[PDB]
From a paper:
The S-GSAS-D614G-K417-E484K-N501Y (the “triple mutant spike”) showed reduced binding to RBD-directed nAbs DH1041 and DH1043. We identified 3-RBD-down, 1-RBD-up, and 2-RBD-up states, as well as intermediate states that showed one RBD in the up position and another RBD partially up. 3-RBD-down states accounted for ~12% of the total spike population and showed considerable disorder in their RBDs, with the disorder being most pronounced for one of the three RBDs and its contacting NTD. Taken together, these data implicate the K417N-E484K-N501Y substitutions in the RBD disorder observed in the 3-RBD-down states and suggest that the E484K-induced conformational disorder in the RBD tip Hook structure may be the source of the increased RBD-up spike populations due to weakened RBD-to-RBD coupling. In the spike, interprotomer interactions made by the RBD in its up state, and secondary contacts that the bound antibody makes with adjacent RBDs, may play a role in stabilizing antibody binding to the E484K mutant, thereby explaining the retention of high-affinity binding, albeit at lower levels. For the triple mutant and B.1.351 spike structures, the RBD tip disorder presumably reduces the stability of its contact with the adjacent RBD, increasing its up-state propensity. In the B.1.1.7 variant, this occurred by modifications in the interaction between SD1 or SD2 and S2, whereas for variants harboring the K417N/E484K/N501Y RBD triple substitutions, RBD destabilization was mediated by RBD-RBD contacts.
Changes in the spike (S) glycoprotein in these variants are under scrutiny because the S protein has a central role in engaging the angiotensin-converting enzyme 2 (ACE2) receptor to mediate cellular entry and is a dominant target of neutralizing antibodies (nAbs) elicited by either vaccination or natural infection. The prefusion SARS-CoV-2 S trimer is composed of S1 and S2 subunits separated by a furin cleavage site. The RBD transitions between a “closed” (“down”) receptor-inaccessible conformation and an “open” (“up”) conformation that allows binding to the ACE2 receptor.
Author numbering:
A (entry chain B): 992 to 1090
B (entry chain C): 745 to 811, 813 to 827, 855 to 1140
C (entry chain A): 745 to 793
D (entry chain C): 27 to 66, 81 to 143, 165 to 172, 186 to 242, 263 to 298
E (entry chain B): 299 to 620, 641 to 676, 689 to 744
The structure:
Amino acid sequence: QIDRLITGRLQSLQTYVTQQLIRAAEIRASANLAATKMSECVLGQSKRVDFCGKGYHLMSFPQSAPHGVVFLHVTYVPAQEKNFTTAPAICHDGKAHFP
Amino acid sequence: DSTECSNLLLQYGSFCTQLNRALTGIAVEQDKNTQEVFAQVKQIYKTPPIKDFGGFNFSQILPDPSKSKRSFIEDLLFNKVTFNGLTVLPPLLTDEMIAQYTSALLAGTITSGWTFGAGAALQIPFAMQMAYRFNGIGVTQNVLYENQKLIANQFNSAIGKIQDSLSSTASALGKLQDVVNQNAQALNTLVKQLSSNFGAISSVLNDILSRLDKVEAEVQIDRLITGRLQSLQTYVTQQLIRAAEIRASANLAATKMSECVLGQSKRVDFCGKGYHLMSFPQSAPHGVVFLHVTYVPAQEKNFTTAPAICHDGKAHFPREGVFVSNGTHWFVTQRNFYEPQIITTDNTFVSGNCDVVIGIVNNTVYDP
Amino acid sequence: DSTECSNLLLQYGSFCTQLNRALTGIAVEQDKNTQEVFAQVKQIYKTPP
Amino acid sequence: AYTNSFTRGVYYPDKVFRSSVLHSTQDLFLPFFSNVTWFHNPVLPFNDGVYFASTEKSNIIRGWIFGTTLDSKTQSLLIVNNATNVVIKVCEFQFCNDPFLGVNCTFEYVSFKNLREFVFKNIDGYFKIYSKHTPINLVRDLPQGFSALEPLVDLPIGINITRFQTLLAAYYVGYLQPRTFLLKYNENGTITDAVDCALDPLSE
Amino acid sequence: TKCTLKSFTVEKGIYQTSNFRVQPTESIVRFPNITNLCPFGEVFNATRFASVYAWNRKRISNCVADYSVLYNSASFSTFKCYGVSPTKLNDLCFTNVYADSFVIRGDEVRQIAPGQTGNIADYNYKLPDDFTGCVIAWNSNNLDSKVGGNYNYLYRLFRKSNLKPFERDISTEIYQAGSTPCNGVKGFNCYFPLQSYGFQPTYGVGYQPYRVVVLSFELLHAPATVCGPKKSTNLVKNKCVNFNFNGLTGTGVLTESNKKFLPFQQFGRDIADTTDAVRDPQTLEILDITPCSFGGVSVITPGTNTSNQVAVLYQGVNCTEVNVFQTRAGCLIGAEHVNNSYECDIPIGAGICASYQTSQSIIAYTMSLGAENSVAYSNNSIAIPTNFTISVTTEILPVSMTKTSVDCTMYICG
Ligand SMILES: *[C@@H]1O[C@H](CO)[C@@H](O[C@@H]2O[C@H](CO)[C@@H](O)[C@H](O)[C@H]2NC(C)=O)[C@H](O)[C@H]1NC(C)=O
Ligand SMILES: *[C@@H]1O[C@H](CO)[C@@H](O[C@@H]2O[C@H](CO)[C@@H](O)[C@H](O)[C@H]2NC(C)=O)[C@H](O)[C@H]1NC(C)=O
Ligand SMILES: *[C@@H]1O[C@H](CO)[C@@H](O[C@@H]2O[C@H](CO)[C@@H](O)[C@H](O)[C@H]2NC(C)=O)[C@H](O)[C@H]1NC(C)=O
Ligand SMILES: *[C@@H]1O[C@H](CO)[C@@H](O[C@@H]2O[C@H](CO)[C@@H](O)[C@H](O)[C@H]2NC(C)=O)[C@H](O)[C@H]1NC(C)=O
Ligand SMILES: *[C@@H]1O[C@H](CO)[C@@H](O[C@@H]2O[C@H](CO)[C@@H](O)[C@H](O)[C@H]2NC(C)=O)[C@H](O)[C@H]1NC(C)=O
Ligand SMILES: *[C@@H]1O[C@H](CO)[C@@H](O)[C@H](O)[C@H]1NC(C)=O
Ligand SMILES: *[C@@H]1O[C@H](CO)[C@@H](O)[C@H](O)[C@H]1NC(C)=O
Ligand SMILES: *[C@@H]1O[C@H](CO)[C@@H](O)[C@H](O)[C@H]1NC(C)=O
Ligand SMILES: *[C@@H]1O[C@H](CO)[C@@H](O)[C@H](O)[C@H]1NC(C)=O
Ligand SMILES: *[C@@H]1O[C@H](CO)[C@@H](O)[C@H](O)[C@H]1NC(C)=O
Ligand SMILES: *[C@@H]1O[C@H](CO)[C@@H](O)[C@H](O)[C@H]1NC(C)=O
Ligand SMILES: *[C@@H]1O[C@H](CO)[C@@H](O)[C@H](O)[C@H]1NC(C)=O
Ligand SMILES: *[C@@H]1O[C@H](CO)[C@@H](O)[C@H](O)[C@H]1NC(C)=O
Ligand SMILES: *[C@@H]1O[C@H](CO)[C@@H](O)[C@H](O)[C@H]1NC(C)=O
Ligand SMILES: *[C@@H]1O[C@H](CO)[C@@H](O)[C@H](O)[C@H]1NC(C)=O
Ligand SMILES: *[C@@H]1O[C@H](CO)[C@@H](O)[C@H](O)[C@H]1NC(C)=O
Ligand SMILES: *[C@@H]1O[C@H](CO)[C@@H](O)[C@H](O)[C@H]1NC(C)=O
Ligand SMILES: *[C@@H]1O[C@H](CO)[C@@H](O)[C@H](O)[C@H]1NC(C)=O
């Protein structure tokens, strides 16, 4: 009878440790991303689109949270556009000018 | 659905619940993976009725109203990839909804450049958007406007080669087909393991219950329960490992959406080989296809070069270019395309006297 | 290397084949991993004398 | 005398329909490209089972006997292709060596241009018989090609067999070995090809 | 849902709480046409039997033993059984079956039982003391008696020693019973070992002859050549049923099929060896099998800290099997279908979502992907932003789990 309890309790514990190994691999991928967000968003100014939140990135600030991190990403968003006619070049004394 | 076996299976406790919680997390993740790649666009942008894109021809990658409403290339991609308590579940986004996202991403990209990812979509003429993407690789924008027919052709031809490759090949799309194959093989292995005895008298549950009286039949069924529960734990553990690989691949695809489609990446080899110009999303079964457009420098010539030049004892350095000589005369060019300017006081800047610089040369600087 | 044991192991079905298939997938991926890192260059460039 | 078997002696191993599929199974089969003894009526070993074949339309070949002593001391199985239909009986037989053309009992049952092929085996007291018929271009040896043999009878006779003999103008014999074969079932559930897995490394 | 989550409060969501499964509406049994009935009638209506000293045995093999004619054969003056009940015999199978047959007076039929004694049990037919089988008799005065006495029926009066169980001995040498020598001739203690009942038609009921047959049964390593009748049901297409075709037990829906089995094949298997078609053994048509309809049942709810309405989704089930609405994810019961589209609140599948909205109800809708927009494109027109907003976005990332350790010996063995 004890050998049936050992068999089932040992399988119960193997199932748990396997799912904790698979879950710790997911949390490591998230910690590697959070460490990269701190180097590139907080310690610098990222040119990578949507890496440090939507809009053009200005800076970001880390705040601690239990089991994690929070980034406050400060970004520049263009707000009030108007329409204009446009041209690729302008022609002066028979020569093409580019901006 | 044997009541004799079902009562013995209760003695194993939570295992049967916790396998379904595990597979539920896999199923819910697949919808999130698909959402994080394709749902990166705030509004369902649609293309103009006019097609004045400066000679570039997107008709192979844009929606076809006569078709789901997929593009021509998305139909090649959808054609080239091809029950014992087991159930499959539908995705949250239908293949038509995924095609509306690749449509909106593509219409936004063509009509408004990188601007629709950073805020409101701002219209810009496509040849002027491509001129800015040339500045983003360090090639001056006049190199596009002076070569626009030759860049519009050869883009159109390079897109035609995608259709011909996907029409003629039988292996190139195999990275999506292998994901289909592993999941079919996993369910066939799980079902074939119902035929196994695991050392029991038979693998058929009514056969056991016909041959043997209650106390011995209970001993034989507990072997099938042990082996079938080990068979199902083996499947769910392997799907948990296989789903972690697909999630890492979906996070890479979501990053290629943001940085290659919604932007212009300066990261080497991130958005295809060569200096990246832009890329286009196309949907495919269980995945995404990126058509990465890049600039490749192609017909090089050798030149003599110098790091600085002496004028009136002053050392001159180029502001943006590099100094080169054709053998007799000295010029400054932009660095990624040969275009020689005559050296002037506004092509260059001064820093100190000649004597410090290793390999300086003597040539006139014209002051305009 | 026992025939008496091998015929009892054969009552468990796909388990032995799918263990070998998993280790083969791991092994083929180690060559892939190494080629994705090092084989990034088209031609074997050489330095001058 | 010996001749090659080619890809012959495959039979439908079970009464299961399968369609447009490849199925892998282990059973007593004649190994591909093995050689077979050719004869022109000795007592022979039976081993695990026999593939027998002949070209016949005179019916000089007429039947078989199967057993251990074949005669008197214990029961044996008699089979005869009587021109009305096949006759089968199990008795403590004491009949002559073989009947020929002028060129207690415990069970009973009643049913050249063509190659005729038969497979006989005994498993757990059931005697299994399979057969097929085909025209042939060249009488000297078994023809290079494929054709699956279909079950005739599944007799509950229980009696032991280790030797057999023909009752009877030339015929082939080869022995079934425990082999794994991969069988191809087409859209109509006929077997149309096979791979003998232990033949060569391509077959593996 | 509260019981599934082990909680009195349930948060907003879709939760699987059950599996639906359509039940077998009845049981089917199908076997070959009931044929090759055993030759029991050849013994029970024979012209006459042997003398009891030389009892006559019929081998029964390779046939169906329907004993039910015997169960109803009220002309039997007895039908005893030992080791087994007569009514059970139609459920059974055996390797060999025997019927042992003789004539004796009614006052000696009572010697035919396990452990009995007297000249018939001692010297003619001995049953085992643990006998498994049946004893049958009927009065045969009008069949076996004759005027002046029928002397053609005999029994062994005496023997040197008693019979072993089923020992058969038909030798008729003079039995020397004592010290007086037999001398090859009839005399006192030099008995001819047989005597006769001399059956007269004027005999009384215990003196009269009875025809007797003893049934006996054995199951060996050799195959079960004798079995009871395979009584079979009607065949019930297009419903959920339990079925038994020959030995193939299962549960499912039986339908006509386009398949083309070969004449010897009885049933068919799918790519993963799961059965999917069968030949009916009474009318040789090919039937498809499909499973009884089944799937997860999920309960769709706003949080209980807002409302107690719910909707129920039967995943992959057609609504015929169970406001009510067929989604492509399965039938949805208790949610109002809407022609508008909104962003997804609770996800159902195949483009469908559900929400709780205002008088309030759970509603189901095709999900909105976003507002439709046409960018004002042309050659030679551009939009340039005249103002901006500084935006602060929040992003939240996990970094660590709770750290755990286990004394594996204390968890397993306490
Ligand atoms: C955009 O490219 C497509 C190429 O598929 C052009 O349509 C084809 O044009 C050729 C001749 O150049 C015809 O033979 C084909 O029948 C056309 N149809 C298809 C489906 O290939 C299309 O005309 C181009 N659009 C513009 C505005 O130039
Ligand atoms: C730059 O390369 C292009 C090709 O990539 C050259 O254009 C080709 O010129 C030949 C001249 O006979 C034509 O036959 C081809 O049809 C042209 N191709 C295209 C796509 O238009 C171009 O001449 C090269 N320019 C320089 C300065 O070398
Ligand atoms: C180096 O480039 C210069 C300018 O392109 C070349 O000088 C010109 O040569 C042509 C005849 O080949 C004359 O018509 C021009 O008047 C010259 N211009 C100047 C500014 O001198 C020069 O020939 C080139 N040298 C070599 C070796 O190719
Ligand atoms: C670049 O021009 C300067 C000035 O004309 C050259 O300097 C002369 O170098 C020679 C040899 O060392 C001396 O004899 C002169 O006295 C130097 N003159 C002055 C005013 O310094 C210089 O040699 C030239 N560089 C090269 C590489 O030819
Ligand atoms: C099993 O027995 C049934 C009943 O006798 C057979 O079915 C009948 O077959 C005759 C053949 O002439 C038909 O005329 C009838 O219409 C059939 N049905 C009925 C209800 O009688 C059946 O053929 C037998 N099957 C086998 C395999 O022996
Ligand atoms: C720009 O042009 C479009 C189409 O003419 C018009 O709808 C829009 O109101 C204009 N103004 C702005 C600010 O986009
Ligand atoms: C000139 O350029 C070509 C092309 O890059 C190169 O192969 C060649 O070696 C160069 N010339 C010399 C003298 O090295
Ligand atoms: C460059 O190398 C050559 C020898 O190959 C040498 O003559 C020359 O002086 C060197 N120039 C510089 C700037 O080092
Ligand atoms: C038949 O097969 C055996 C296999 O050992 C071989 O020795 C023999 O030579 C073969 N004979 C012929 C004629 O094929
Ligand atoms: C076989 O042949 C004999 C005559 O030789 C014939 O009487 C008999 O009926 C045939 N057998 C059967 C099963 O009919
Ligand atoms: C068959 O052979 C085995 C082993 O020799 C023996 O035990 C068994 O009794 C035999 N059966 C018959 C019917 O001869
Ligand atoms: C299968 O049978 C059908 C008729 O049922 C026939 O048309 C076909 O030629 C057969 N063979 C194959 C390979 O399908
Ligand atoms: C004898 O034959 C008749 C024929 O109708 C049958 O009914 C009966 O069951 C048979 N057996 C006995 C014991 O009468
Ligand atoms: C329950 O809902 C109320 C509003 O209906 C809210 O104020 C409260 O915080 C919620 N939670 C609990 C535990 O009451
Ligand atoms: C389900 O069953 C009904 C009636 O048989 C049918 O009309 C309906 O089309 C089926 N469901 C689907 C999703 O097709
Ligand atoms: C929904 O729209 C369909 C036509 O698209 C119509 O038949 C149906 O009556 C509408 N239902 C409601 C609630 O308006
Ligand atoms: C677009 O270009 C065409 C052709 O050059 C011209 O007629 C049209 O006015 C242009 N549109 C705008 C808004 O500049
Ligand atoms: C720009 O937007 C701000 C609010 O974000 C507003 O107060 C300000 O007046 C605007 N300036 C102009 C010139 O439009």
